[PDB]
């Protein structure tokens, strides 16, 4: 896991990434068990997230500012992020 801080410049400018629903493959004593998850689907060209080189397409979003997204909907998680947009920190599980 990596904690990624995303800075915000314009009040009207987005942090520069899209999120989507996905499937997380996770490990349990039984074996690999699928679970719903939230992922970065793409980055805005020229945007803030891109420019950092810290977020990648298909990184899995694990937490928004310390709060796990497990069990939340895509809209709920979107609302968490934008609320926190001035000081957004996301814990990701990198695709690489």
């Amino acid at each position: 896991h990596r904690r990624v801080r995303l800075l915000k410049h314009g009040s009207d400018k987005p942090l520069g990434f899209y999120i989507r629903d996905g499937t997380s493959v996770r490990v349990t004593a039984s074996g690999l068990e699928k679970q719903p998850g939230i992922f970065i689907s793409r980055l805005v060209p020229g945007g803030l997230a891109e420019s950092t080189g810290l977020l990648a397409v298909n990184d899995e979003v694990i937490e928004v500012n310390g709060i796990e997204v497990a069990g939340k909907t895509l809209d709920q998680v979107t609302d968490m992020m934008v609320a926190n947009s001035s000081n957004l920190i996301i814990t990701v599980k990198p695709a690489n």
């Binding site: 899209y18 999120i19 895509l74 979107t78 934008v82």
Partner: peptide, 7 residues
């Protein structure tokens, strides 16, 4: 609902 959300 929409399948992608801009942040």
């Amino acid at each position: 609902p929409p399948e992608e959300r801009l942040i």
